[PDB]
Symmetry: C5
Subunit: 268 residues, 5 copies
Amino acid sequence: QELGNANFENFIGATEGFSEIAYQFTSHILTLGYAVMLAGLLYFILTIKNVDKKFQMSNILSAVVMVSAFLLLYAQAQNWTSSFTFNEEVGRYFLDPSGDLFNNGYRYLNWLIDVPMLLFQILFVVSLTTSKFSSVRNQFWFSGAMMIITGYIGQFYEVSNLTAFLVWGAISSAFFFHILWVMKKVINEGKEGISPAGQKILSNIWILFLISWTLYPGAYLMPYLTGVDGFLYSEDGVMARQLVYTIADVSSKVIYGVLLGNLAITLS
Amino acid sequence: QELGNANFENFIGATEGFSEIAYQFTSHILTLGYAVMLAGLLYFILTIKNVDKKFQMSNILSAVVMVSAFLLLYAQAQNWTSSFTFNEEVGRYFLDPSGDLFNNGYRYLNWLIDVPMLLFQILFVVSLTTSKFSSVRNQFWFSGAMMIITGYIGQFYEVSNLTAFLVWGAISSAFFFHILWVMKKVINEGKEGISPAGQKILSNIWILFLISWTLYPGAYLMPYLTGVDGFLYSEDGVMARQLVYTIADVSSKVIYGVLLGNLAITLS
Amino acid sequence: QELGNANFENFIGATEGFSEIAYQFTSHILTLGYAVMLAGLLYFILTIKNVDKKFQMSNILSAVVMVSAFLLLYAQAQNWTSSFTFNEEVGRYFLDPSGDLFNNGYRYLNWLIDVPMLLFQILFVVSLTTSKFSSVRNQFWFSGAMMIITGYIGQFYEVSNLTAFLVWGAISSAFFFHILWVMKKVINEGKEGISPAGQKILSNIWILFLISWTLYPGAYLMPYLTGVDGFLYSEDGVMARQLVYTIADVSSKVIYGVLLGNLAITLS
Amino acid sequence: QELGNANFENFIGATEGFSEIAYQFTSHILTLGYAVMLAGLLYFILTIKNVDKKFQMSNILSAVVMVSAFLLLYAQAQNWTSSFTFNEEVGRYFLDPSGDLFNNGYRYLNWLIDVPMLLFQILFVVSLTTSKFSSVRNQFWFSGAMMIITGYIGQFYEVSNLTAFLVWGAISSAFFFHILWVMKKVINEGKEGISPAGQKILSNIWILFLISWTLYPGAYLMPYLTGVDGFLYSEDGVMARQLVYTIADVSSKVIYGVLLGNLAITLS
Amino acid sequence: QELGNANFENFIGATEGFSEIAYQFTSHILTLGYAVMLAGLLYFILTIKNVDKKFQMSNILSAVVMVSAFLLLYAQAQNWTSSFTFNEEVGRYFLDPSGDLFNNGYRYLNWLIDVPMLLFQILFVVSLTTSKFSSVRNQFWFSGAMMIITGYIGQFYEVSNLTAFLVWGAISSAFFFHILWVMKKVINEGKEGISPAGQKILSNIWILFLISWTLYPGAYLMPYLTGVDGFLYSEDGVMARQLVYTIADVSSKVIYGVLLGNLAITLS
Ligand SMILES: *C/C=C(C)/C=C/C=C(C)/C=C/C1=C(C)CCCC1(C)C
Ligand SMILES: *C/C=C(C)/C=C/C=C(C)/C=C/C1=C(C)CCCC1(C)C
Ligand SMILES: *C/C=C(C)/C=C/C=C(C)/C=C/C1=C(C)CCCC1(C)C
Ligand SMILES: *C/C=C(C)/C=C/C=C(C)/C=C/C1=C(C)CCCC1(C)C
Ligand SMILES: *C/C=C(C)/C=C/C=C(C)/C=C/C1=C(C)CCCC1(C)C
Ligand SMILES: CCCCCCCC/C=C/CCCCCCCC(=O)O
Ligand SMILES: CCCCCCCC/C=C/CCCCCCCC(=O)O
Ligand SMILES: CCCCCCCC/C=C\CCCCCCCC(=O)O
Ligand SMILES: CCCCCCCCCCCCCCCCCCCC
Ligand code: NA
Ligand code: NA
Ligand code: NA
Ligand code: NA
Ligand code: NA
């Protein structure tokens, strides 16, 4: 079977196949994912009037991310189940080409909505001090798009060209470090001249942000984290990757949105 | 045929097959399930302004659960019909591997939304007395997630490893007893210093909670409740399990939400 | 072929097959059905504030029924088209087992929502006089569920066991007569001490109720109404049954809801 | 092959097949159709408060028609693509019986919603003078249903029995002429004692009504308008018919609704 | 294989086939497209009350375009994946006739909503000076429809008749130049007697308009832009075309709508 520049799930699914647990888990975690997003959409819409008009843009942007994330995860869940089919003679699910190969790249292009809107929404809650809004916004959006695109290219080479995979991901990482550096400047300015309770929320938002956002590059490298022919180069790694995605999606999108609403309430 | 760590429906469906009644009933009860949830969604949204602002979070959380439960039951209903196909020569529905094996695990991971939100929503209606909100919330969420996850593992071994099934379910049970113990402390504190009419509603909520939540472990054990090769190890048990799920979903999600709204009204 | 406890559509569809007209009509009438329900949903939501707050629960319950009925009819419409497939050599649609057998039981379990909510909603518009609300509600809900369940069993025996079909439907009928007796007591109490215009609406609601609700048992018996091997034991009866269902669904759900809103307006 | 009482699209699709242009166009025009309807739904809902409460029923009814028309056109678009399949050896789309025969009758039964609601909605904007509302409403609804039903029968005989097709359509026409006669009486009464600007809108509504509604009988006769074996008895006529439907649907439903809102604004 | 008047994607997909990257990218970019549109729908609805009543029509029309664009892109995304299927022996996706040929014409007919509504919506924000609203509206709508229709014809000949493709596109272009000429007159009148900040936004709207709208004819010519048998006559051009569409859809529909809301805010 010639798979070409495909993701490692397809190679696992075409050789070993997936056990019931691996196949079902992956389907279940993607389903939890999209349910959280649609549930989050309703929450953010229903709580808009819980904050001053000046902060209501943050609820709106949280809802815009929820829609993107719902539609994407819903599609990816159907994509997963269409790509792998059960073989009763062996009792494992194998790659079914009729359903197309499974690709994570669906998420990446959808992050062209999520990442800009997530970085933007804090600038409608915190007040900056030494930094200008257009400048920060422009840095966030430029580096976000660069990070996403360079990463989207690399992920097509995860099995077919390991050098390319690592170089594109290295470049993507440099844009990610820049986003982190700017979000730190934003959180620190935002803490200036606000209540101790709001500085506590901004402190938590910074940890959430740092961990949740670092899960994505960790999903990118998941197959190779246990090395050459390691534990993770297998159905366990396939499960690990979609699990990490779901955790990072809930944390980076919903819980972040909730924490930002709590900060808005404290400042209202 | 090799089914592996699959649910007992697949083994019934692969050997005996399901009669028209068993197959149709199961499809009908899952359909009733998701219709109730979407109907409940609309009810909770349309009644939000029937309570004081301080209690409106409970309506919002009821609606968040409705969305989760709708999406899950809708998917599981399509999953059921895709997995079993009619054989005209024998007149029974048999496992169709093309549709994947049927798994209840879809529900379990979706309870990672439901259980936390259901336990949380009472804390926005009752007032605690000797117990601190963060502490109770944290206990509810930790034990909930532990209960769900340990149970989610066990259910994959219901046929393949009975020992594992029973040990994981035993561990899950210990977390469940802890949730019950805490919800009793919450109901009793909540009854302190409220009207006799509200204490009556909280009394009913406690019984609803106790029975509806105990149905889930009962669905978990359903195939084996009549023993080895008993009445329930059969298409009757398959019907019994999805019936019990639907009853427990309506009771634990919709009727609980309605009762909590009635309590909020009495306290408004 | 062995069909077992299936509905008479399957036996017609497996022997004679359906003409273009019979197959298309049935598909068209189910489609009209679900379109009416979704259109009704929007109407009831958009008119909620046309009545006093005390009567707005009736609009809400009308909307809850619309959702149930939409989802069910939408599913049944897809079920119809999946079960019967066109045979070009004969020019008739024949039962396709791959799509599963067609069953009316989907409606029945969905009436566990509709019947309770329809009977409940009048009690939020009329005022009872000698009758207590909990008592009436409890009678309506108990007899409704009994009527539905006993009827749901019988319909699986319409071809396979005529005795069973008739006995279960006879039992179902006794619960139906009780519902009628109670709704008469409700309408008569409700007429006491209201304007002549509202007593006219309640008079109409009672006729609507009595005819529309009696259509359901008539659909239940449809194949046999023209006797053994009569006109209706055929594709004409299949068409007749789904037609009667659609008429009764529009009358019992939408037009009833509209009439109850008109009564609420007169009492506002 | 035996097609029976089917629409002429099926005979074209089974003999000649459709060119890429004919097949794609028909799919595109049905898609435009349902997009307009869902877009219209949003417009009518968002503009409800642009008119006095007394005229807001007209916006509501416009939205009820939009839902019906959306659901129907969405279904018919999927029906079209399922019925005709591409044959690479010849490069034309041919009738695929697996997808069922294509039938226009879906629209007809859905007009049992549209026609009554469209005729009704003007009576919530104009004021009648010598004519009584119940009487006019009853005439509109009776003749509408008669027109639709007699026409729905005829369309099944467009190829199989030309005499029947023409007789049923002739009867349908007589009910249509009655609707026209009554709508003229309504427009003329409605013009009495209103501003010159509103009489201008009612003048336009009357032309819109007369042309848009006359397109439907023109679609009914489309195959035969160029005679025996004429230009229109072909894939061109198939395209012509769905084009005419889409134009008439936009005109009779959306533009009419918009014009009625403009009249309501002038009278507010 | 006889493809007839089909788009160039089908010829590429039938000869060379698409690599994983080409096939996946195209699927991903169409998915981003429809997610942006549904996310935009929510944004425009949630911000309606951020502007004076007189400008709220512009938000409504932005939302009407979002619905059209969502439904179309959602359909086209499913169309793409249905038309091309994976061949494991070669590792490329090839045209699957069962899914129908892929056609861009779906977009074109949907522009019969978008183009009129986009041109109309500025006339609800700017005030004209020497130009009459009906006159401008009528010019925009006539030329828009002419541009779209002539272009819709041409695109069916992109491979089959290059002369026809170029002549129809030339005619379409003349209507496009007229739209540009009129939108310039509108922007210049609109700038007269408004604040410097609003003239800056109108200056940006004009550039957005000019570039975003010129991308469409560029997508039309994409295969031939690198000449005879050039780089773009290939899977790269297929990717380039859908990429350009998505960029132009986001720019011309969402960002334009957002900029018009900012202008409305400055004038409120
Ligand atoms: C909800 C979506 C979010 C917050 C997405 C975030 C994505 C990243 C932070 C991606 C980062 C990557 C790298 C730093 C290297 C590897 C490639 C990426 C794109 C996965
Ligand atoms: C609406 C969803 C609800 C309330 C879900 C509740 C689930 C439980 C109480 C599950 C309990 C279990 C045990 C106590 C043991 C066996 C395994 C479980 C997870 C089914
Ligand atoms: C919209 C749904 C409604 C009002 C459903 C009503 C259903 C009945 C009144 C059913 C009655 C039946 C009998 C009296 C005998 C035969 C079995 C039943 C369940 C069809
Ligand atoms: C949006 C739906 C509308 C306004 C439907 C209108 C339908 C008609 C005016 C149908 C008329 C017909 C005849 C007068 C003769 C042939 C049969 C009919 C039903 C197509
Ligand atoms: C969101 C949709 C928009 C703004 C659509 C715009 C479409 C055009 C400006 C199309 C122009 C064309 C030409 C000028 C020549 C070739 C054919 C067309 C229709 C693509
Ligand atoms: C599996 C998906 C489950 C989704 C659950 C989402 C839960 C959202 C709640 C976020 C918690 C908000 C921050 C809590 C801080 C507590 C400390 C304090 O406020 O004193
Ligand atoms: C292809 C489908 C496109 C849908 C577009 C629908 C546009 C509907 C708007 C029509 C409003 C026309 C009102 C009549 C204007 C008369 C002139 C005047 O008011 O002076
Ligand atoms: C098949 C699913 C049907 C769903 C129906 C749900 C109905 C829930 C509505 C109300 C439950 C109220 C229970 C408590 C009643 C107490 C009586 C009292 O107030 O005296
Ligand atoms: C509420 C909707 C009501 C729709 C009823 C539609 C009834 C369709 C019945 C079709 C019967 C066709 C066979 C007889 C036709 C006789 C005339 C033509 C003879 C060739
Ligand atoms: Na699968
Ligand atoms: Na099935
Ligand atoms: Na069919
Ligand atoms: Na097709
Ligand atoms: Na594909």
